[PDB]
Structure formats: structure tokens, C-alpha cells
Amino acid sequence: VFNASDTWTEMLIMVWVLGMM
Amino acid sequence: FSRIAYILPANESFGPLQISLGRTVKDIFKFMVLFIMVFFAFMIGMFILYSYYLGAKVNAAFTTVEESFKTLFWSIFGLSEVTSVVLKYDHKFIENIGYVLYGIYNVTMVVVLLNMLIAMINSSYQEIEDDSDVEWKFARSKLWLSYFDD
Amino acid sequence: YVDWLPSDPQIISEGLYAIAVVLSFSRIAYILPANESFGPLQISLGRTVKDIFKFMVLFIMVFFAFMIGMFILYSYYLGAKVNAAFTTVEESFKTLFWSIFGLSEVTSVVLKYDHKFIENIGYVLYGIYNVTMVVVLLNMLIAMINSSYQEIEDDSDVEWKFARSKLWLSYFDD
């Protein structure tokens, strides 16, 4: 949600979903 | 004007009405909590989808969070229109994504939640019977018992 | 190297991102039944979904049946109706889906060429679809759900206990 409204956040979300997988 | 409920249950043919009203309100509280959960879930996705279209839709739709709340609230009653999904830039892919998302929200949320509510209310009714008179008597007892002391 | 497109991977990325967001926000059902006042709710929800699956299959059967006829009726009217209605299959799906909720309009049947006969045929067909499908299928669904409820009673606590048991039993081993 924080990334939704107005680079680091993108990579953090990617790392989180990689951990889920 | 809504505060009249104090002097309503003293009468005969109106007590059980009020009592079952309160009962069903207390029951549908939890269904309201789950429905706002799914509402939030759909509305965040809908605000992220059309976040980068300022002035590209037909109507003033899906531009800010306040407008998303407006449309997703007023569509529960059939008062909002489907034309709130059409675009002006071609981008046919995003257009189909939005049609699909809006439709699936509509069907799922509205239909399944309504049928759950009514079937579970008939459930919660069919188990408790014949004591509505008792509950109305208890309420009316509290009512004209509070007038004695001072 | 130096010193807005029709089909760009950026828009596709955003569009898939939206579906992924909605799915992850819907994934909260794992940590829902652990609480007290919320288990039986989820359990009856799953039960009614599994029940209405078959009603959905029959409803899409009749939907297909009506929509093929409606696409054959106005197949030879390209630019003759009032609105952009009943011209291609995608548009037929659109109107027949969005009329289930009262969001589609009746003016999606009026023509511009006179052909009064085909106009009445279309009004009759659209009306009879509306009445039959919507009303009879909804009343069947609700009466049969109250049926499937009235036979099974007092074990909702049991089912919620079984679900919650699976839930915090999966946390022990590893």
C-alpha cells in the first residue's frame, strides 16, 4: 500500500515474494 | 428523530419488532466486518490499476481514492454505471482487465455475501423460538421499571 | 546508446500487478479462522460456495443458449441499432452479463431500420431471457440453500473446531 500511493520498495516486494515462493 | 426508540417498546404490537431488529443488527455486525475487508481488498487494487490515467476515462472515475470509494459504494445498489470503466486511450488490455475485475467483484461480493447473510439469519432464527414474548417482556420491564425511584 | 506504445510490457506489468494485489489481499483467509467469532462464518461461506458451483454451471449453460441465439439474431445489423449492441460476440457477452444486475438498458434493443418484426422478436427474446433466467434461478438457489441448511444443524461449532485444529496444528513440526 505504501508503494501504491506517492526503487527500494520495488526490490523489497520482490524479495518478499521470492521468500514466499 | 431516531431517538424515539426509548418510548417505542412500551406498546403492545411493537416490542418484538424492536427486539428482533436489535438482534439482527448485532448479528450482521460481523458480516459487515468481512464485507468491508473484501471491499478494501478490491478497492486498493482498483485504485492501483487506474492510478496513471488522469483524464483518460469516460467519466470522472477511478482517479483518486475518494472517487474509488464513491463508485464501489454506489455500485452495491445498482446506482453506478458500467460506463465508469471505458477509456479514451486505446490500451485495450487494461480495459479488459478492468471490466473483468469490476465484474468479478460485483458477482462475488454482492451475491455470495447477500446469500450468506440471509441463509445464516434464517439459521440463527430457526434455533430460537417462542421466547420473543419473553424478550419483549424483559425489555418492557426494564423500560417502565426505570421510572420508580427518583 | 545516445550519449506511449500500443502493446508495451509496462502496461501489461501494471495490469498483472493489479490482479496480484487483489489476490494477495484476498489471501488473508489463512489467519482468519484462528479467532473466535469468525470461524463458523468462513466455514458456512465455503459450504455455500461449494453448493452454488453447480447452479453456476447450469446458469452458464442457459446463458450460452440465449447468447448464441442473440448473436445470430442481430448478426446482419452492423451499425443499425441505437447503441453499439448485439454486433459481435464480445459485445453480446457484455450486455448479457451486465443485464443480470440491472446495469444494462432496454434501449440496447431498439433499431434504426424499420424491420418491426425483428424488433419485436428481439424484445420478446430479451424479456423472456430476463424473467426466466434471473427470477427462476435466483429462487431455486435460495430455496435450495435453505434446504441444505435445514437438514444439518448444531455441528457448525464442530466444523469450526476442526478447521481451527488443522490451522494451529500445522505449526508444530518444523
Side-chain angles (χ1 to χ4, degrees), chain B residues 27-45:
Chain B
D27 274 357
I28 69 163
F29 192 78
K30 341 170 193 299
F31 297 81
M32 186 174 302
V33 117
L34 188 151
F35 183 77
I36 72 106
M37 184 59 203
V38 178
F39 169 92
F40 196 60
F42 259 114
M43 169 264 296
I44 278 191

Side-chain angles (χ1 to χ4, degrees), chain C residues 1-132 134-174:
Chain C
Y1 168 74
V2 176
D3 199 64
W4 207 104
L5 286 176
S7 295
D8 204 303
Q10 58 180 3
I11 64 179
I12 301 178
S13 180
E14 190 171 343
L16 305 188
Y17 186 80
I19 310 181
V21 164
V22 180
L23 288 183
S24 56
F25 265 119
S26 202
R27 209 230 79 163
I28 210 184
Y30 274 173
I31 71 176
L32 186 127
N35 197 350
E36 171 60 31
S37 61
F38 303 136
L41 188 47
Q42 182 82 9
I43 303 303
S44 44
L45 257 162
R47 180 206 330 279
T48 57
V49 167
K50 287 186 184 68
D51 274 357
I52 69 163
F53 192 78
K54 341 170 193 299
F55 297 81
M56 186 174 302
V57 117
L58 188 151
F59 183 77
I60 72 106
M61 184 59 203
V62 178
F63 169 92
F64 196 60
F66 259 114
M67 169 264 296
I68 278 191
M70 274 302 204
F71 175 77
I72 286 174
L73 174 56
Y74 294 102
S75 168
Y76 300 78
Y77 289 80
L78 291 73
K81 306 203 56 180
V82 170
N83 58 331
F86 292 85
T87 313
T88 340
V89 187
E90 307 177 354
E91 118 77 34
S92 170
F93 202 141
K94 185 89 60 180
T95 57
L96 230 132
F97 191 2
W98 291 115
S99 55
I100 314 176
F101 308 93
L103 304 172
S104 182
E105 309 130 17
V106 185
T107 171
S108 64
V109 199
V110 201
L111 310 188
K112 293 181 181 179
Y113 287 100
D114 342 329
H115 293 160
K116 198 179 182 185
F117 178 81
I118 291 194
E119 192 173 9
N120 273 335
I121 286 302
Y123 267 108
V124 164
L125 212 150
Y126 188 82
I128 184 70
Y129 150 74
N130 202 334
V131 176
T132 293
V134 166
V135 185
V136 177
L137 265 296
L138 182 67
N139 273 31
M140 273 298 305
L141 256 108
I142 287 183
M144 284 313 300
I145 283 172
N146 299 348
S147 175
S148 63
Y149 145 74
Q150 186 58 61
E151 58 174 10
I152 297 182
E153 271 272 39
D154 195 71
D155 53 0
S156 69
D157 321 67
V158 184
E159 286 184 338
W160 158 65
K161 286 278 176 48
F162 201 73
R164 163 181 164 184
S165 296
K166 275 177 179 179
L167 182 56
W168 41 227
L169 175 64
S170 41
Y171 276 110
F172 286 120
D173 316 325
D174 276 353

Side-chain angles (χ1 to χ4, degrees), chain B residues 1-108 110-150:
Chain B
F1 265 119
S2 202
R3 209 230 79 163
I4 210 184
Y6 274 173
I7 71 176
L8 186 127
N11 197 350
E12 171 60 31
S13 61
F14 303 136
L17 188 47
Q18 182 82 9
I19 303 303
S20 44
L21 257 162
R23 180 206 330 279
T24 57
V25 167
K26 287 186 184 68
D27 274 357
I28 69 163
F29 192 78
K30 341 170 193 299
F31 297 81
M32 186 174 302
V33 117
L34 188 151
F35 183 77
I36 72 106
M37 184 59 203
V38 178
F39 169 92
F40 196 60
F42 259 114
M43 169 264 296
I44 278 191
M46 274 302 204
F47 175 77
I48 286 174
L49 174 56
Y50 294 102
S51 168
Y52 300 78
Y53 289 80
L54 291 73
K57 306 203 56 180
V58 170
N59 58 331
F62 292 85
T63 313
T64 340
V65 187
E66 307 177 354
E67 118 77 34
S68 170
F69 202 141
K70 185 89 60 180
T71 57
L72 230 132
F73 191 2
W74 291 115
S75 55
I76 314 176
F77 308 93
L79 304 172
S80 182
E81 309 130 17
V82 185
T83 171
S84 64
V85 199
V86 201
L87 310 188
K88 293 181 181 179
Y89 287 100
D90 342 329
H91 293 160
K92 198 179 182 185
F93 178 81
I94 291 194
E95 192 173 9
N96 273 335
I97 286 302
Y99 267 108
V100 164
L101 212 150
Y102 188 82
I104 184 70
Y105 150 74
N106 202 334
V107 176
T108 293
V110 166
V111 185
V112 177
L113 265 296
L114 182 67
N115 273 31
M116 273 298 305
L117 256 108
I118 287 183
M120 284 313 300
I121 283 172
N122 299 348
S123 175
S124 63
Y125 145 74
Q126 186 58 61
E127 58 174 10
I128 297 182
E129 271 272 39
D130 195 71
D131 53 0
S132 69
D133 321 67
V134 184
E135 286 184 338
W136 158 65
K137 286 278 176 48
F138 201 73
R140 163 181 164 184
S141 296
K142 275 177 179 179
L143 182 56
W144 41 227
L145 175 64
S146 41
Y147 276 110
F148 286 120
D149 316 325
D150 276 353

